Amino acid sequence: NKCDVVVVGGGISGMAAAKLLHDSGLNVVVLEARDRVGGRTYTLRNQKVKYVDLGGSYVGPTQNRILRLAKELGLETYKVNEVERLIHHVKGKSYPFRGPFPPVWNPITYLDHNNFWRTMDDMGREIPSDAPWKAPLAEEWDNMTMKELLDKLCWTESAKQLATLFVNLCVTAETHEVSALWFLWYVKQCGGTTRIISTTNGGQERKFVGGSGQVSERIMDLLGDRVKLERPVIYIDQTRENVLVETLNHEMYEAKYVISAIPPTLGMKIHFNPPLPMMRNQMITRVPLGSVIKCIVYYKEPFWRKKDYCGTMIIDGEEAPVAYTLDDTKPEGNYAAIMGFILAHKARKLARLTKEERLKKLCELYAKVLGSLEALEPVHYEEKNWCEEQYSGGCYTTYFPPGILTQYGRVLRQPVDRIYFAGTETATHWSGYMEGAVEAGERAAREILHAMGKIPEDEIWQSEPESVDVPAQPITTTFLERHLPSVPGLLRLI
Amino acid sequence: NKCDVVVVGGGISGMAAAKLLHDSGLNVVVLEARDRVGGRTYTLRNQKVKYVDLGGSYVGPTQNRILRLAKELGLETYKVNEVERLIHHVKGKSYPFRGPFPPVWNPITYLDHNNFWRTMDDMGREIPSDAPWKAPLAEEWDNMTMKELLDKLCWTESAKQLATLFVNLCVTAETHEVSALWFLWYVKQCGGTTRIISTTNGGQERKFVGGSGQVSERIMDLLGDRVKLERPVIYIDQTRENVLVETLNHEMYEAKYVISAIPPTLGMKIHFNPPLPMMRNQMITRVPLGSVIKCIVYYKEPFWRKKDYCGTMIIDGEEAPVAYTLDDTKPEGNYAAIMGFILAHKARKLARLTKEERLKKLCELYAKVLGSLEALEPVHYEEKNWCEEQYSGGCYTTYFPPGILTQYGRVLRQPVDRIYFAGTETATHWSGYMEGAVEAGERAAREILHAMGKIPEDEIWQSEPESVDVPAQPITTTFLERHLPSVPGLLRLIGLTTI
Numbered sequence: 001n002k003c004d005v006v007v008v009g010g011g012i013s014g015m016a017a018a019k020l021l022h023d024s025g026l027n028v029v030v031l032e033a034r035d036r037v038g039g040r041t042y043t044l045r046n047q048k049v050k051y052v053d054l055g056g057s058y059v060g061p062t063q064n065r066i067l068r069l070a071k072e073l074g075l076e077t078y079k080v081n082e083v084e085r086l087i088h089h090v091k092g093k094s095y096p097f098r099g100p101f102p103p104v105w106n107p108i109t110y111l112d113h114n115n116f117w118r119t120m121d122d123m124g125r126e127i128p129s130d131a132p133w134k135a136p137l138a139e140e141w142d143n144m145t146m147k148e149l150l151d152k153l154c155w156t157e158s159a160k161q162l163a164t165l166f167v168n169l170c171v172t173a174e175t176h177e178v179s180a181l182w183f184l185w186y187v188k189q190c191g192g193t194t195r196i197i198s199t200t201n202g203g204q205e206r207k208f209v210g211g212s213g214q215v216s217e218r219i220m221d222l223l224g225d226r227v228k229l230e231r232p233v234i235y236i237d238q239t240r241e242n243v244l245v246e247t248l249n250h251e252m253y254e255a256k257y258v259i260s261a262i263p264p265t266l267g268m269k270i271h272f273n274p275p276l277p278m279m280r281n282q283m284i285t286r287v288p289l290g291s292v293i294k295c296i297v298y299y300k301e302p303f304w305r306k307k308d309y310c311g312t313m314i315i316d317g318e319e320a321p322v323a324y325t326l327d328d329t330k331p332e333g334n335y336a337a338i339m340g341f342i343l344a345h346k347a348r349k350l351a352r353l354t355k356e357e358r359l360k361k362l363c364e365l366y367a368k369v370l371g372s373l374e375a376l377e378p379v380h381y382e383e384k385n386w387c388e389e390q391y392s393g394g395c396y397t398t399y400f401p402p403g404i405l406t407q408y409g410r411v412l413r414q415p416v417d418r419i420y421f422a423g424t425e426t427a428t429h430w431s432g433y434m435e436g437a438v439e440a441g442e443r444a445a446r447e448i449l450h451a452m453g454k455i456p457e458d459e460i461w462q463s464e465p466e467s468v469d470v471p472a473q474p475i476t477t478t479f480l481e482r483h484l485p486s487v488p489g490l491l492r493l494i
Numbered sequence: 495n496k497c498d499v500v501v502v503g504g505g506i507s508g509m510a511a512a513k514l515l516h517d518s519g520l521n522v523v524v525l526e527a528r529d530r531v532g533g534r535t536y537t538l539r540n541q542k543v544k545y546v547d548l549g550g551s552y553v554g555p556t557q558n559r560i561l562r563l564a565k566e567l568g569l570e571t572y573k574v575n576e577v578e579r580l581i582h583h584v585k586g587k588s589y590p591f592r593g594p595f596p597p598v599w600n601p602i603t604y605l606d607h608n609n610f611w612r613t614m615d616d617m618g619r620e621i622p623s624d625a626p627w628k629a630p631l632a633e634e635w636d637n638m639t640m641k642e643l644l645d646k647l648c649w650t651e652s653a654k655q656l657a658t659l660f661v662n663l664c665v666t667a668e669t670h671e672v673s674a675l676w677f678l679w680y681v682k683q684c685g686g687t688t689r690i691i692s693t694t695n696g697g698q699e700r701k702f703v704g705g706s707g708q709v710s711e712r713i714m715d716l717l718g719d720r721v722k723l724e725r726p727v728i729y730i731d732q733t734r735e736n737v738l739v740e741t742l743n744h745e746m747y748e749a750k751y752v753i754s755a756i757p758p759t760l761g762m763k764i765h766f767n768p769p770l771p772m773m774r775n776q777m778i779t780r781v782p783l784g785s786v787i788k789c790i791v792y793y794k795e796p797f798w799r800k801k802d803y804c805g806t807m808i809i810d811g812e813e814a815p816v817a818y819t820l821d822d823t824k825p826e827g828n829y830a831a832i833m834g835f836i837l838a839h840k841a842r843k844l845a846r847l848t849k850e851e852r853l854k855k856l857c858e859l860y861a862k863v864l865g866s867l868e869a870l871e872p873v874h875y876e877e878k879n880w881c882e883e884q885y886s887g888g889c890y891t892t893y894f895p896p897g898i899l900t901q902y903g904r905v906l907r908q909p910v911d912r913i914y915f916a917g918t919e920t921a922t923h924w925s926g927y928m929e930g931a932v933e934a935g936e937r938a939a940r941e942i943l944h945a946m947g948k949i950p951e952d953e954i955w956q957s958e959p960e961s962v963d964v965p966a967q968p969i970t971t972t973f974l975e976r977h978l979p980s981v982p983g984l985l986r987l988i989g990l991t992t993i
């Protein structure tokens with residue numbers, strides 16, 4: 001019934017908000033729609049897999065807030081297997097390579113590839129993390145799709161296809177669906193191209209021992225009966241003295257403040273009184289989430305390591321169900337597995353198949369790419385299609401179509417009276433990730449602390465010391481990488 | 495509590511569905527979120543305006559379903575004033591003209607203008623009304639915004655600026671926001687460029703005497719207590735034998751079938767058990783509605799008629815708050831008024847201002863455009879920002895961003911068990927209009943009549959006899975219009991000759 005703060009949503013962001021508020025002495029309730037906590041993180045346990053992350057999973061250097069919070073809850077990380085060679089599959093053949101970036105041998109293509117990545121980071125350096133709509137060329141970039149940008153930038157098919165897979169993999173959407181401004185902001189606010197695509201020294205360096213769902217589970221352990229499972233919020237009333245929040249199962253909660261820790265578009269599932277201000281009312285219909293099936297195939301052994309393959313596969317082309325894989329073996333070398341993502345339009349298309357039919361296609365792909373019959377002999381399979389989720393709306397995150405970020409972006413974290421906004425979408429560093437969820441939960445919580453007079457305005461946004469366990473190495477470029485010309489730049493010299 | 499069919503939404507579509515179902519003997523309930531029916535039509539009544547349409551208003555030839563419904567309910571239409579000259583205001587100057595299209599004197603520019611409209615209709619013929627994603631080039635066109643399409647087509651800035659204004663005005667959205675496939679579909683399923691833009695012989699020919707709000711109000715009168723105002727639906731349960739529909743004020747309704755007659759994205763406001771299938775679940779997060787403020791400025795007299803202007807203005811300019819106006823004077827000649835639309839990003843921008851500052855900017859614009867100081871003497875002002883409506887989401891309608899219509903389009907009107915889908919967005923002819931509302935409402939109702947074994951399958955889709963009161967002149971082209979070359983076509987002709 002009555003409390004200081006109602007938090008809507010028990011994902012990482014809501015749980016981190018509620019934990020902070022509770023630790024500071026306020027009475028908090030968390031209202032969660034599902035029969036579990038975690039949201040877009042979900043750890044399945046069974047004897048065959050032991051545990052497996054079917055939702056968010058990877059963490060890495062510079063994500064110091066998720067690392068600190070998990071550490072305090074008694075979680076530990078291990079490193080994703082990247083000891084052996086990566087594979088680029090292109091035109092029906094496997095090219096093994098080392099390093100984050102698949103190599104290119106033709107000199108024209110080389111220039112084109114080099115220029116494309118470098119140009120993404122140049123454009124990023126003009127986009128403010130906390131206000132992408134203030135970029136000098138904000139409207140121009142916002143009014144093009146990433147498909148247009150790539151059509152302008154990439155003078156070769158090879159670069160255009162690799163840059164396309166890069167978009168698909170990062171934001172689970174087609175290049176033609178997304179704003180160029182938003183995608184460039186996204187990459188940049190993750191620390192740039194190298195940091196976002198790298199396993200070693202990047203976002204995919206690590207996983208949590210036991211699963212990432214333990215983060216939310218253990219915060220729910222700390223809050224006891226303050227978390228209400230199967231309480232979907234349907235109505236928020238701000239007209240009266242205290243804020244009133246009603247659930248689907250008929251309960252009424254009453255508080256001074258609310259934190260909305262749900263994806264923006266999921267705001268639509270709530271009837272507000274008074275109506276939302278105009279800009280928010282429309283923003284929340286303009287911001288879908290992407291489409292992904294996360295798929296994990298289990299094998300008796302990590303047989304790929306015998307051939308000096310780490311298990312990472314970058315797979316070009318329309319026919320491949322999966323464009324990107326990582327080794328999902330446990331740190332002990334057991335429960336051998338390959339993780340793959342069926343991305344964007346391939347998720348819409350392959351979801352009509354059965355579970356077994358998807359297994360077969362994956363097994364056959366992997367056998368081709370890894371060049372082993374061992375890939376045809378899986379011992380177990382697990383998958384999750386996030387598009388079918390009523391209370392996520394997709395995965396990994398919310399994407400912005402052309403024109404939206406400049407028109408409505410300012411409203412995302414703007415308080416509506418006594419509702420403050422959390423969720424990974426409202427973050428400024430690794431928004432879209434578990435790290436962003438923590439940043440935004442803790443920030444929304446601290447905005448409420450300040451509206452209550454408990455902390456000054458300068459403590460709303462707090463910096464995070466670097467993890468000692470997962471230190472960050474700097475991102476370096478070579479001299480040639482910085483100064484080799486683009487394709488049209490080599491033409492102007494001729 | 496118990497009925498045969500719960501209709502969610504009491505706009506034209508919901509009210510047309512309910513009426514048909516009622517007229518066939520079934521027990522229906524209409525559950526409407528607001529304290530009124532009509533939805534995106536709303537007729538305001540006070541002594542200063544008598545009546546005024548702040549939402550949907552215009553009807554015209556080929557929109558035979560809304561004309562039959564309104565006529566059966568006792569309503570009349572009248573002709574929007576187009577006796578005197580239209581104005582095209584471009585680069586700070588007004589160019590009076592007659593006919594539907596602003597004319598063009600520079601021959602190069604003339605070629606580009608003729609080709610643009612012609613290619614809109616040409617691409618249109620490739621696109622089936624009932625299945626736009628079946629166009630041979632659906633994918634290619636859907637992965638392109640209307641801004642990209644215009645950048646390819648228009649070799650003159652003049653044609654590109656006119657085309658941009660045409661998109662903004664038709665779909666209340668920027669060229670860079672909307673799919674080219676969707677937009678070409680939307681224009682074709684209204685009968686083409688000419689039909690869509692015209693007053694005389696087009697979409698804007700007429701209005702209803704007393705306002706379009708009476709359509710919904712009269713159906714509510716026929717239905718009596720079957721219409722429940724202030725019952726926003728929060729929850730639909732299909733796991734049991736009868737379908738369970740719950741409202742925000744804690745009432746429960748039970749039915750064999752449900753028609754959802756709300757904008758697709760407002761389907762988000764309902765919690766579903768079991769969950770919606772994947773494709774609908776994501777589609778309803780991908781389909782926003784446009785942005786528009788409709789504004790009416792009243793004057794003592796329709797002073798523009800005296801300078802031989804009908805009061806239609808096509809106003810190109812970033813500075814112009816309004817890009818299109820019409821004479822909104824009563825058929826009797828009194829309550830003289832200019833209606834104007836504030837479109838897309840200007841609705842966003844100018845909503846910051848007060849009512850009085852918006853009035854001031856409109857009057858000043860109209861003064862310049864009409865060359866008339868009288869325009870600075872309004873007697874009254876009415877307006878509505880549709881963007882702030884929780885139970886509409888915007889106006890006029892739903893637009894599809896790039897990539898959405900080919901991936902999700904096929905599910906807009908796919909039944910989900912015993913839920914069936916109405917709303918003008920599900921129509922095949924004048925989707926986005928009051929006409930499409932009636933088509934979709936009636937089609938969804940007849941879908942349920944078929945599931946119940948009361949009519950055969952071929953009676954679900956039913957054609958409509960032509961209005962004898964608002965008959966349609968066919969759309970014609972001249973030989974020159976059809977065969978004059980494009981700008982690149984003339985340039986190809988040149989390179990070939992000089993060889």
Ligand SMILES: *[C]C1=C([C])[C]=C2C(=[C]1)N([C][C]([O])[C]([O])[C]([O])[C]OP([O])(=O)OP([O])(=O)O[C][C]1O[C](N3[C]=NC4=C3N=[C]N=C4[N])[C]([O])[C]1[O])C1=NC(=O)[N]C(=O)C1=N2[C]/[C]=[C]/N([C])[C]C1=[C][C]=[C]O1
Nearest residue numbers: 009011012013033039040056058233395423424432433434
């Ligand atoms: C799904 C997914 C996948 C499959 C994958 C991934 C992901 C995902 N990610 C992301 C994450 O997960 C996120 O970000 C997070 O989680 C977020 O969180 P938040 O913010 O908290 O949110 P959520 O979770 O959703 O929560 C919410 C909640 O709420 C609720 N609700 C709703 N509604 C409502 C409610 N309640 C009450 N009422 C109402 N109405 C719900 O239920 C929930 O609970 C990720 N991340 C990270 O970090 N990592 C990872 O890994 C991930 N993943 C992925 C990634 C990928 N990548 C990166 C790609 C690549 C590779 C290479 C390069 O790139």
Ligand SMILES: *[C]C1=C([C])[C]=C2C(=[C]1)N([C][C]([O])[C]([O])[C]([O])[C]OP([O])(=O)OP([O])(=O)O[C][C]1O[C](N3[C]=NC4=C3N=[C]N=C4[N])[C]([O])[C]1[O])C1=NC(=O)[N]C(=O)C1=N2[C]/[C]=[C]/N([C])[C]C1=[C][C]=[C]O1
Nearest residue numbers: 503505506507527533534550551552727889917918927928
């Ligand atoms: C808004 C507007 C404006 C401003 C203008 C216009 C329009 C609009 N339009 C359109 C119309 O209006 C529409 O279409 C209709 O109305 C629709 O119908 P429906 O489908 O029925 O839908 P609605 O109305 O929305 O209704 C729905 C209902 O539901 C409810 N809900 C929600 N949610 C819920 C509910 N309930 C319960 N529960 C829940 N949850 C609500 O409340 C409602 O009631 C139009 N149309 C026509 O026809 N005409 C006209 O005029 C119009 N307008 C416009 C147009 C213009 N133009 C076209 C111009 C031009 C020129 C050149 C080119 O263009």
